[PDB]
Symmetry: D3
Subunit: 288 residues, 6 copies
């Protein structure tokens, strides 16, 4: 037979305490904190002032990363490591201070509007110091890219070093490598199509398999497109195993072959190697 | 390609709005309200002063139902229809008032401690009135059961009627039915085992299938266990189609047969029916 | 090192599959089904037509239980076992049919408005049959209470029996028990306060501890409040071991003692017991 | 600027700690415990052996309440207060023991299959004792209803009393009340329709508004439907303020008026009240 | 006493509306949107076509970032700012159009398979225009890295500028800084280990603390590893405070010291400073 | 009328299975996996050993990206593509092996502490091979930046190429573009403020609108700040359409105008264009 148990009543005072509500609230907040962290590291932070960076014009993850636009008053306090800044010194130079760092910490600056100049510079103070710099780093190169990295921290020593580069320009090299001079005693090395550059600068170093013979030379070449030729000026020639003070070890000539500015390297010595590298170029663009 | 959608954040500003939290609290309290209503209708209400009728000595559902034990002060205000009361007038009479009812409404009382008396009565006032009673119903019968029922409501016409009966006592009837007087002209009707009662009272009405002959009589019988016999006293005899004022219509005798006090009904008239009903009994018990 | 695991996304394709959503709907409906079953068994079913038995005038649990008030059309189909009915035959007699039952099944009826009569009867048909009744049970007693109980089911043998009693009336017994006739040869048995009844009927059976002497008598008594006395009429006297046909075995007298109608039982025979039982009373009330 | 907060991760190490999971399991079981307690108090407990009282033939709430059918072995241990039992002693008598009770506690029994007899009795032992009974209560009345109630508990004083009555039978009273004898000196009191009963027994007590004149009588009446008359037998007549030992105080006659067996009460004494109460009836039914 | 409240029922129509289900679904989708945004910015987008970038070969976050491979038809519509592209012009030149930008917006291109050439170029049209370019930017440098940045937006003026660099090559500088010429009038500056380069180009500028004396010269040096010597060729010499047209101001010599090609700078003038920077180098590698 | 449904009970065995608990646990873990992936790609991985990269000093998203510091034993197994490394060869050279890659895959190395040298080099083995390299790539340039990119995969061929650059240094170019020589036959081109550099190297190429006349020359200039002048040395002059071997085609002069080192280019020929590019500079800093 059924022997009932006394009356039981649902404790309405236990509809909380680590139950959904508590977990979803604590979870969501954590999730939001993390995403805000990520989005603000790769997106425009100025959007946070609107729906917390949401909406049709809200924050997005830039695969290229993002450089923040901050105000003067905001730079009154040390910047955190890992941040990126797009500096604007249009109305006045700005100073940025970087908090003490640890080995590998980095901070990068960009100058999209090209406001950086000698009168309105970008002054950087990296907590403690910057190597090779007395005091603050003063940047006056417009449209520049400055990267600061901490090269020593341990404890009481926080030292940084920096790099400064142009954001824009044609810096590419059309050719760099090493080629063998075939048994025929000559090798053609295509440098670039006749229409890519008007002028190029290259370094050529030829050495025998045993290093007894070697020559190096710097060459500036001019592309004469109208006559389909290439003028050259070889200088700073240096040789080591030259049998005669007239013995070249290796001759370098230029011309256009198959519409490609081409370097022709030949040598008497057998088993000669030749390193060719284009370290500069100039292309006449459009004025302005 | 994949065109991302701007940043989306979790609206923690919601969550607790008519959700698992609200439906369990609005649901729980609802489940605790109903059950409480059921357990207090079929259980001791006095226990509500503890763990709200819970615990080891908590409230339970009495299949027999339950009769609440209230205090004088509590009965100071009209009682709700459908309630049950176990009255205690040991210290003083108690007055109970019943709220206006509607057809069928019911309130029942009992007196387990038998305190009801003429000095400590149970006074009942049924809003408006009680039929056959001018004013309040005054109950003075100890160990009684009082049932009040609304026999009329409509508008103001809220009238009640009542019944009062003993909670205890031997009230059973060992036999009641109708038997045919067999063609042989005689029928034996066992009433009860010889040890069940010392005396019984019965009503016997014999009638012909046509209805022209009929006799009724009231008989008191005494069980003589020692001599295995039964004395009888037949009176208030009434006959209708009796062809003569002599022996007539049907004879009723008693004796013990197979250890059962038995009634033997015989008649000359063919096709006679005999209704026998025991309406009272007395059994000698143990003094006190 | 930390070797990440590929991207993982939340399978929203799930969530609503047998979870908090499904268990609350499959649970709630279950809780509303049961309670409804309980409140409609102990409350007015007519209220279901409102807020499903809710609200201020909603359904409540009647400790006294409840007797449903249905319509003619509703009784057109067999009623379920265990139900209660408050019959209304004021406009016309009503026929109620009870579905086949099993041993113990029960259906109860009452007649609060007292409409039951011979012209507007309560006809009851218990699937299969009712003992001692050929066909339907025809109830014509106004303000009655009818109880039907299945006394046999097995296979088709589904038979019922019934009881019919008055809802109202004074049915209590002011005294019933057994008393010893003290060695002094006399015993006083208080029956009731002088103001409780005008007349009473009692059964008295005196028997010796051995069982050789025994007497029973039926006595009607009238309370004469004005003269503080009690008239009595003793009849249907029966004796067994009476040594003589003269005064014998036990005498029964009445009077008022301490304001209580009292029975005084005396006997010459030592070691006599006396069972006294009041089987009827009449109290003059207020006309109408 | 936006200064992010370090990475935050979701503490899955929690979740299932007193949350939706725990409150539904601790709540559900609670809801299933209570309902089970209610359905088993008002429904067949034998069904618990199936789908825990569920399914098509599951447990239901009986408005009439329910009386459990247990086995001998189950009754080997004391029963809880408030329970109901449908006894079966067809194969052998059964002994039921009731745990110690407190004032008002109740246990009820019925005998639907009418197996109770002197050879296969229902023996009841109420922890401590039953008033007027030395030892166990031995019930031998078939088709009876036994009610046990604790009339005293306190400390060890845990005493019970009981009532026993027939489950079936016609026990109703067709009339009970008080009527004024109109100034005309006569009053008609309709008792019942001529077809309702063959014989009735009534008590009649007439008393003057002052109380100096009073008469009571017991009358048995026989309905002669064929001749549309009613025979009566008035006896045990008792009078108090009767100015003469001749015809006196009030006369009682019977007849059929408007098809209703009717009592006509008349008296010379002005200002007389008449209480009439039918205490027994007999109706010839169908044999067997 | 307990005064129950009417029946209450759990509203099953409130198992939704901002409850778990709604929040978890809306939350998860947002979370997924964000992660897809991040992963697609730093991972292969071509994987989205498979299990939405999940699985054992699903998307991962590249610390180095990622450059997407898109098809010709996909470039038919403007590319979003912040995206990265790995161009493939193997079967035909491809044109990319960049949506209008805002100050700082950036888009970067890479050419991993070296397909870029004059016949199958990378044509870029940056909505509105590119500074120093008439119309589209036509890139013909294979294995190149092109970066476009918006240098002016405001409103109706969206101007971009670009940088083009080689993805590969030895561009490092083995030494750059400023050294003091000790009072001894000479300073050794280690340039690089004898085995790192065969040829180097440096710029040397010496200036007195007061800037009255200063000399600048460009020097190409050849490392003769066999004889453990270094040949040099100094030219473009310029001086300002030279006392005589024979006075050098500062002499620069080279040799191998401690196995490091070393610059030895000496001067008569006291307090002379010397800036040394290696602006080019050549190392003979392996042919092909 | 209400026709109840059998008992229903809440299945406590369904408080799980894809319900909150399961989804929140599976979701959270996925979320954590993703964020750990992101944070470890842009943050210090050494922090994972502490509270899983959480806390006040927990991991953060570096907008500049991050280069991991791993131990020798960790480099015993192939590095995944997309990773970044800050190499430390202070106590011994380290070897890194890169897993097979696919077109575009990249791995980048940095040397923040400048430990890289010939005795403690950075040896890199890119599964399969590196173009122009026999076997492993041996890096001996301190404070270097090495980038490896896969330029060919398909199937059985996984070839990589690399770039090596200095992490630090002044590499910026103060001017690069093309200017028209006005009809006046002369044009001034500001190069940089007098205080920015002591020496600069530029390439100048002038060509007529029809390309019949053209001249190219390399020029080193020295800024004499004390006398506010600029000394120049023009060489490697090459011309094509020169009418006479004395006809210059274009003359280039230098001076300080408005405090800016300035190039003045003039020519007889009408419609002459002039490309000016500064390919190197030297600024005397502070010794040490």
């Amino acid at each position: 037979m059924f022997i009932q148990e006394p009356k039981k009543l649902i404790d309405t005072g236990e509809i909380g305490n680590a139950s959904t509500g508590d977990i979803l609230f604590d979870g969501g907040n954590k999730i939001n904190s993390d995403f805000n962290a990520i989005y603000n590291a790769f997106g425009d932070q100025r959007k946070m002032a609107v729906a917390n960076g949401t909406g049709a014009d809200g924050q997005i993850i830039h695969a290229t990363g993002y450089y923040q636009k901050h105000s003067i008053t905001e730079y009154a306090t040390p910047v955190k490591v890992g941040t990126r800044h797009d500096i604007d010194t249009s109305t006045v130079g700005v100073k940025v201070i970087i908090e003490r760092g640890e080995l590998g910490d980095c901070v990068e600056f960009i100058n999209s509007n090209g406001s950086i100049s000698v009168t309105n510079p970008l002054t950087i103070q990296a907590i403690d110091s910057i190597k090779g710099v007395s005091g603050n780093l003063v940047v006056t190169s417009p449209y520049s890219k400055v990267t600061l990295r901490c090269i020593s921290s341990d404890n009481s020593t926080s030292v940084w070093n920096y790099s400064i580069e142009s954001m824009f320009g044609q810096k590419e090299s059309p050719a760099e490598g090493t080629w063998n001079i075939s048994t025929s005693g000559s090798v053609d090395i295509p440098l670039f199509h006749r229409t890519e550059y008007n002028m190029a600068k290259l370094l050529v170093t030829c050495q025998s398999v045993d290093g007894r013979k070697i020559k190096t030379a710097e060459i500036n070449i001019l592309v004469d497109t109208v006559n389909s030729e290439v003028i050259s000026s070889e200088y700073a020639v240096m040789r080591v195993g030259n049998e005669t003070e007239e013995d070249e070890i290796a001759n370098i000539a230029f011309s256009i072959k198959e519409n490609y500015v081409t370097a022709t390297i030949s040598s008497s010595t057998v088993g000669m190697r030749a390193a060719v590298k284009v370290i500069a170029t100039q292309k006449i663009g459009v004025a302005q």
